[PDB]
């Protein structure tokens, strides 16, 4: 739901 | 958490290694409300991507849940952008170094409503950092403190914050300061963090005003970061 | 100035003696509450507290050494911060509740407006003071720091700035001195000093968000803001 | 200004 969720992932 | 097992030098170098790069703006001196906020928005949006990757390399941050990471970043993103700004602007008295190809003075903040007040606050903070001879090792400690403390209202973050405090003291003792000079300098640095918070909240109002006007296109990321403060 | 000549214990005694009293609200349990009337309670309370704060500030070592314009500026900038840290201090012994007045205990439920987020932040700060076991001597030092630091950033006037800086250093030494007497190690002293000063960042935040909330209702034509309270609020615009 | 006056008295 948030872009910040996706970007903080990308391990 | 590996952050607690780190030595002071390991903590410092980890923060140094996590440091985002100084980015450039596009290539005319801004005066209008559109072009000024247009260049700043584009720069900040690109800086945000680096900040996120920087945050994940800050010791102890990754150990938090994703939702906590989101909360802390939403709370502190403008604070982090601003302390980076005043740091870059240290060697340029009376000017704000948003980018090496984008030096702004207070005269350009005049032509935008409610801008020059924040400009002067940023300039005063930068001047204070210069008079204190703020070191890069100290700066990265302060920026990490902002990230972890600004939304912190937990036991883990508490110990990490204490760890960074020990790291700051380590740096001052390493620089040859006495115990008296250490706790005095520590206090002075942390009191500035209160002013950084104030400027962020004022800047957030300014951005919210720009968004409401709807002339300068905001990125979807910047929107979410901004709307997170909408309450 | 006599402020720079004071010892740590003398600084503490001065601040403790300068402490304002705890005022009562006109809250009545038998009287029906409303969203506007509740804000009216807090408004009337804060307005009466301001007069005591102003006289409190005059007894803060180094404050009256400043020009009148600088004294006005600092109080204009910090009045809500000082009110809030006082509120947070009074609410320590009451988990999940805010003690605005001895006859006015409010929880997160008994709410409004947008204010509920601010309420939670105040509660969290109070919970922080509680777990830190904040002492009264530490509290009066913190409140004095807020007064002098919150507003500070031709020709000179610069002279006013470094005078504040020296007094701030004195309160810093006072804090360290207090912690040293408490039996804390050097590591624990620096850590606690840091913990205490980082809370000031939160108090600043709650003040800014609170100022937005107060400015929000002022446009809603809802609550009788006093003449002085209108001045203090208008100084933060925008 | 009220604050200015109260600081005097
Ligand atoms: O490196 C930085 C630091 C701060 C800013 C901004 C600031 C700092 C100066 C403020 C007062 F004018 C406005 C917000 C900013 C952020 C997001 C935007 O969409 C637009 C601007 C940009 C890059
Ligand atoms: O002792 C205190 C501390 C804070 C407040 C206020 C608060 C604290 C709680 C906030 C959350 F809603 C609102 C601001 C306040 C101030 C002025 C007003 O006109 C109205 C209220 C009053 C007395």
Chain position carrying tokens 């720069």: B43
Write the CB contacts of B212 (distance below 8 Å, at least 6 apart in sequence): none
Instruction: Compute the distance between CA of residue B109 and CA of residue C166 in angstroms, rounded to an integer.
Output: 32
DSSP letters for B157-203: HHHHHHHHHHHHHHHHHHTT--HHHHHHHHHHHHHHHHHHHHHHHHH
- Asked if D3 and C72 come within 8 Å (Cβ–Cβ), the reply is yes
Segment holding C105, helix H or strand E: strand C104-107
Instruction: Compute the distance between CA of residue C173 and CA of residue C15 in angstroms, rounded to an integer.
Output: 14
- Asked if B66 and A8 come within 8 Å (Cβ–Cβ), the reply is yes
Of C68, C227, C232, the CB nearest to D7: C68
Chain position carrying tokens 């800050």: B58
Instruction: Compute the distance between CA of residue C100 and CA of residue A5 in angstroms, rounded to an integer.
Output: 39
Residue nearest to atom 20 of ligand 2 (CA): C43
- Asked if B153 and C195 come within 8 Å (Cβ–Cβ), the reply is no
- Determine contact, residues C208/B201, Cβ cutoff 8 Å: yes
* Chain A contact for B70 (CB, 8 A cutoff): yes
Token pair, residue C99, equals 């003690």
Write the CB contacts of D1 (distance below 8 Å, at least 6 apart in sequence): C72, C231
DSSP letters for B79-148: HHHHHHHHHHTTTSTTEEEEETTEEEEHHHHTTSTTTHHHHHHHHHHHHHHHHTT--HHHHHHHHHHHHH
Chain position carrying tokens 């720079």: C4
User: Helix/strand/coil (H, E, C) string of C42-82?
Assistant: HHHHHHHHHHHHHHHHCCCCCCCCCCHHHHHHHHHHHHHHH
Count CA within 13 A, CB hemisphere, residue C130.
16
Instruction: Compute the distance between CA of residue C143 and CA of residue C127 in angstroms, rounded to an integer.
Output: 18
Q: A6: helix, coil or strand? A: helix
> Quick one: CA dihedral B174, B180, B185, B191, positive or negative?
positive
Of C118, C116, C15, C120, which is closest to residue C62 (Cα–Cα)? C15
* B151 conformational bin, left if phi > 0, alpha if psi -120 to 50, beta if neither: alpha
Q: Which residues of D touch C227 (CB under 8 A)?
A: 2
Chain position carrying tokens 């970043």: B73
Instruction: Judge whether B88 is annotated as a binding position.
Output: yes
Residues in chain D: 9
- Determine contact, residues B30/B36, Cβ cutoff 8 Å: yes
Q: Please classify residue C185 by burial: count the beta carbons closer than 10 Å to its beta carbon, then call 0-12 exposed, 13-18 middle and 19+ buried.
A: exposed
**Residue C171: domain span:** 1-238
Token pair, residue B126, equals 């930068």
Residue C151 per-residue DSSP state: S
What is the CATH number for B53?
1.10.565.10
Q: What is the resolution of this structure in A?
A: 2.2
Q: At what angle do helices B220-227 and B66-88 cross, to 10 degrees?
A: 100
Cα R_g (chain B), whole angstroms: 18
Q: Please classify residue C25 by burial: count the beta carbons closer than 10 Å to its beta carbon, then call 0-12 exposed, 13-18 middle and 19+ buried.
A: middle
Chain centroid offset of residue C33 CA? 27
* Chain B contact for C236 (CB, 8 A cutoff): no
In 3-state terms, chain A is what percent helix, strand and coil (to 5)?
Answer: 65, 0, 35
Residue C189 per-residue DSSP state: H
Domain count, chain C: 1
- Determine contact, residues C38/C109, Cβ cutoff 8 Å: no
Experimental method of this PDB entry: X-ray
Of A3, A8, A9, the CB nearest to B224: A3
Q: Please classify residue C181 by burial: count the beta carbons closer than 10 Å to its beta carbon, then call 0-12 exposed, 13-18 middle and 19+ buried.
A: exposed
* Chain B contact for C166 (CB, 8 A cutoff): no
Residue B2 per-residue DSSP state: G
Residue C116 per-residue DSSP state: H
Closest Cα in chain B to C148:
B191
Q: B21: helix, coil or strand? A: coil
Token pair, residue C169, equals 């250093």
Q: Which residues of B touch A4 (CB under 8 A)?
A: 52, 70, 73-74, 221, 224-225
Say if strands B95-99 and B102-105 run parallel, antiparallel, or are unpaired.
antiparallel
B97 - beta bridge partners? B103
Of C77, C91, C103, C111, which is closest to residue C211 (Cα–Cα)? C77
Say if strands C104-107 and C97-101 run parallel, antiparallel, or are unpaired.
antiparallel
Residues in chain C: 238
From the CB coordinates, do chains D and C have 3 or more pairs under 8 Å?
Answer: yes
From the CB coordinates, do chains B and A have 3 or more pairs under 8 Å?
Answer: yes
């Amino acid at each position: 739901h948030k872009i910040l969720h996706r970007l903080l992932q990308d391990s | 958490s590996l952050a607690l097992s780190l030595t002071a030098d390991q903590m410092v170098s980890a923060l140094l290694d996590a440091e985002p790069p100084i980015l450039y703006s596009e290539y005319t001196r801004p005066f209008s409300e559109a072009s000024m906020m247009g260049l700043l928005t584009n720069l900040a949006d690109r800086e945000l991507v680096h900040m996120i990757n920087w945050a994940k390399r800050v010791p102890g941050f990754v150990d938090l849940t994703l939702h906590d990471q989101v909360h802390l970043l939403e709370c502190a993103w403008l604070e982090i952008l601003m302390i980076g700004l005043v740091w870059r602007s240290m060697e340029h008295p009376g000017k704000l170094l948003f980018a090496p190809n984008l030096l702004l003075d207070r005269n350009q903040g005049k032509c935008v409503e409610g801008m020059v007040e924040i400009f002067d606050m940023l300039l005063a903070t930068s001047s204070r950092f210069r008079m204190m001879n703020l070191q890069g090792e100290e700066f990265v400690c302060l920026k990490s403190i902002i990230l972890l403390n600004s939304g912190v209202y937990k036991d883990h973050i508490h110990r990490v914050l204490d760890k960074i405090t020990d790291t700051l003291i380590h740096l001052m003792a390493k620089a040859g300061l006495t115990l008296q000079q250490q706790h005095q300098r520590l206090a002075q640095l942390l009191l500035i963090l209160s002013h950084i918070r104030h400027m962020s909240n004022k800047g957030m109002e300014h951005l919210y005003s720009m968004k409401c006007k709807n002339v300068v296109p905001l990125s979807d990321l910047l929107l979410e970061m901004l709307d997170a403060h909408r309450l």
